[PDB]
């Protein structure tokens, strides 16, 4: 006889999780703000972590890890990669990024790196993004910095991946989204199914104003791409179609060419923040579903772009992903092959 609260109605993932908990006897949905719960499906911002686990009779579990924002925010992820001992010297899968503040700034270091590639004749395209809206792709540091100063928000100048892996037919850009569930005991689980947020326009290296070929954001493609849904429904390619394209056109499997790097990046990222977010020494337990965003270059190298704390699932994967959250993260604490447990070699 377990009880749960829902403090985020906008979360599509946990709305399905709530329905899965109901219609299976064991769970009763308590009113919002009712503190006598077992599971809390909390809000995205300002979650009351301090009030959790202070009833010495019931076991409390929350769908978020306190402090995950030091990995899921654009500027804090850049800070983590460059300053964590586990990542600062070993990270070869994160594009060269610098935190910029408009009118802890790394503005001077960006200009030094921009001038170094310029003098050597190296690729100098950079992308600026706020912590799809307010994104500028340019090969001019003067143009990029001025863009930041206009908006009143912290931006991050990341090195633009000028040579991405282009899907054929169409010759189009894409990004990979992977769903990772970390349970109460910090066991990292990669959901078997991923999604490719593809572009429906052919990719070209010259015109950066054409956002339909340069930005693979789902909202950018539905609102501006004239060929939206031309190659695949809702510009979303799944791992079966992507593995078939890879094994055919490039003669290599998705598991070896891309998924091994993905699994390595996920484990390195979550374990760098593990000591700062572990609920071992806290009165309550935590679990979180993450959305890892990757970009593959033409040499088949995976690059981490962003990490999402509150991700949204693909329509067909909602049933399996939400059932996996119920079984692995909820039923492990409160008991009545689709998730790979990511582990170290030794």
């Amino acid at each position: 006889g377990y009880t749960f609260v829902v403090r985020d109605e906008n979360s599509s993932v946990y709305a399905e999780v709530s329905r899965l908990l109901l219609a299976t006897g064991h769970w009763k949905r308590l009113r919002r703000d009712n503190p006598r719960f077992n599971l809390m499906l909390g809000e995205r911002n300002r979650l009351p972590f301090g009030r959790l686990g202070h009833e010495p009779g019931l076991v409390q579990l929350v769908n978020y890890y306190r402090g995950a924002d030091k990995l899921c925010r654009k500027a804090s992820l850049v800070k983590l990669i460059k300053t964590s001992p586990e990542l600062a010297e070993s990270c070869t899968w994160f594009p060269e990024s610098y935190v910029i503040y408009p009118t802890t700034d790394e503005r001077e270091f960006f200009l030094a790196s921009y001038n170094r590639k310029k003098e050597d004749g190296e690729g100098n395209v950079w992308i600026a993004k706020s912590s799809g809206e307010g994104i500028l792709i340019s090969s001019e540091a003067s143009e990029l910095l001025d863009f930041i100063d206009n908006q009143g928000q912290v931006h991050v100048i990341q090195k633009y991946l000028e040579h991405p892996l282009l899907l054929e037919p169409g010759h189009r850009k894409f990004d990979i989204r992977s769903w990772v569930l970390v349970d109460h005991q910090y066991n990292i689980y990669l959901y078997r199914e991923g999604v490719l947020r593809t572009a429906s326009e052919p990719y070209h290296v010259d015109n950066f104003q054409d956002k339909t070929c340069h930005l693979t954001n789902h909202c950018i493609q539905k609102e501006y791409s004239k060929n939206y849904g031309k190659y695949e429904e809702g510009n979303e390619m799944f791992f079966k179609e992507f593995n078939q394209y890879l094994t055919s056109a490039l003669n290599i499997t998705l598991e070896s060419s891309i998924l091994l790097q993905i699994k390595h990046i996920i484990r390195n990222c979550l374990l760098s923040v593990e000591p700062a977010i572990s609920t071992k020494h806290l009165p309550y337990q935590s679990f979180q579903l993450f959305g890892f965003d990757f970009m593959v270059d033409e040499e088949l190298k995976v690059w981490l772009i962003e990490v999402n704390g509150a991700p949204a699932c693909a329509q067909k994967l909602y049933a399996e992903l939400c059932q996996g959250i119920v079984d692995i993260a909820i039923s492990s604490v409160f008991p009545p092959a689709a998730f790979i447990k990511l582990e170290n070699l030794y």
């Binding site: 006889g1 686990g53 009833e55 010495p56 009779g57 019931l58 076991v59 071992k280 020494h281 806290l282 009165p283 309550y284 337990q285």
Partner: protein, 425 residues
């Protein structure tokens, strides 16, 4: 059928004091020793643990021993401190410094005869003494060294009686000194030879329960003693209340100990309470699944890593006996591989109407071969130090010889190999 209770050292007196507070409440005895209970089914076997004094007062048949007055002065001042017979407080002034040799050979040998005089006095006033129960830790010096010294002397004077102990095993997670594996190994060697039944209360298990299960991040000795006193209450229910199963120490030993040396029991309890916890009353199926779960064991051993030789389950409170039998039969049918097939009907069940406290609870007592994991952990720690003769000067300085350590290490390794032999049978 009287039991003479002895508590020795800091741990022994702290858990012992709690045990008396707990059962005194259950039996309707107040701190003054007067009975004010709402049932007489509290006084039916009250004589097993209490003596009857002048003004209808019930006095615990307890002997409080320690080489330092500190812990015993704390007891005398606590809630039920006035319940004990003042003459039964036997204590020295120079403690034991967490040294087994000091408790067993030097400091303890000077105080032991006066303790035996009190034991003898309590025994002479027994219509039919069943035996003794000692509470103590194995990691310290008084409870560990002097406690096993007392056991040896008592056995010499009462060889035909049952010697039962509640022995707190040491753990690095809840440690007082680095020499605990030395003290524990030396004591286990004594226990293997001179006790009929020992309840292995592991501080590692009590810590992991408080930390991982109860989510008491930063647990205290008081937290560990909450679990202990609750388990001690459960395992002694069959001796304190009218019953048919394991009603005395000897029948318990006959049912639980198939091989003389294999008498170390793994207690279990459900529900796992936390001092001042919240609302529900656990259904019989829930009580059964928990008490058999590794997470409810008072010894840090995975029962799935060995087999049960014998098991004794005790349910307390008003519940369906038919449901208890169904649930008890189900746990065995669902895990029949973890119960030795060569001991038919090795799981016995008892039910007591009087609950602890709680509306209903379940206590588990298992003689599992997985208990070797506890002795292996200690043996590993002991060997890591003994190999390099670390800290031996504190022991050899008291008269002890290295040969004594080699024998204790060997006897405990033999105990482990014996438990493994019956696990592979």
């Amino acid at each position: 059928r009287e039991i003479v209770h002895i508590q020795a050292g800091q741990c022994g007196n702290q858990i012992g004091a709690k045990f008396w507070e707990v059962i005194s409440d259950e039996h309707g005895i107040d701190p003054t020793g007067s009975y004010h209970g709402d049932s007489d089914l509290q006084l039916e076997r009250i004589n097993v643990y209490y003596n009857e004094a002048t003004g209808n007062k019930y006095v615990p048949r307890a002997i409080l021993v320690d080489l330092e007055p500190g812990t015993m002065d704390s007891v005398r001042s606590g809630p039920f401190g006035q319940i004990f017979r003042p003459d039964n407080f036997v204590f020295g002034q120079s403690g034991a410094g967490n040294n087994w040799a000091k408790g067993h050979y030097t400091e303890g040998a000077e105080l032991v005869d006066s303790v035996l005089d009190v034991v003898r006095k309590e025994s002479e006033s027994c219509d039919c003494l069943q035996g003794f129960q000692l509470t103590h830790s194995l990691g310290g010096g008084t409870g560990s060294g002097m406690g096993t010294l007392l056991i040896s002397k008592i056995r010499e004077e009462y060889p035909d009686r049952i010697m039962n102990t509640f022995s707190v095993m040491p753990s690095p997670k809840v440690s007082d000194t680095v020499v605990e594996p030395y003290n524990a190994t030396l004591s286990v060697h004594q226990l293997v030879e001179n006790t009929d039944e020992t309840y292995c209360i592991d501080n590692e298990a009590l810590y992991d329960i408080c930390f991982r299960t109860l989510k008491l991040t930063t647990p205290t000795y008081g937290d560990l003693n909450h679990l202990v006193s609750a388990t001690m209450s459960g395992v002694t229910t069959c001796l304190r209340f009218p019953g048919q199963l394991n009603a005395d120490l000897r029948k318990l030993a006959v049912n639980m100990v198939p091989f003389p040396r294999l008498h170390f029991f793994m207690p279990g309890f459900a529900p796992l309470t936390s001092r001042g916890s919240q609302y529900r009353a656990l259904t019989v199926p829930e009580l059964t699944q928990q008490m058999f779960d590794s997470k409810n064991m008072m010894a840090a051993c995975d029962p799935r890593h060995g087999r049960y030789l014998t098991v004794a389950a005790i349910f307390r409170g008003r519940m369906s006996m038919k449901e208890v039998d169904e649930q008890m039969l189900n746990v065995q049918n669902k895990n029949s591989s973890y119960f030795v097939e060569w001991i038919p009907n090795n799981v016995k069940t008892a039910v007591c109407d009087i609950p602890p406290g709680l509306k209903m609870s379940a206590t588990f007592i298992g003689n599992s071969t997985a208990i070797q994991e506890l002795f292996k952990r200690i043996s590993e720690q002991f060997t890591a130090m003994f190999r390099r003769k670390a800290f031996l000067h504190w022991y050899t300085g008291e008269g002890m010889d290295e040969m004594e350590f080699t024998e204790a290490e060997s006897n405990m390794n033999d105990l482990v190999s014996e438990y493994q032999q019956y696990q592979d049978a």
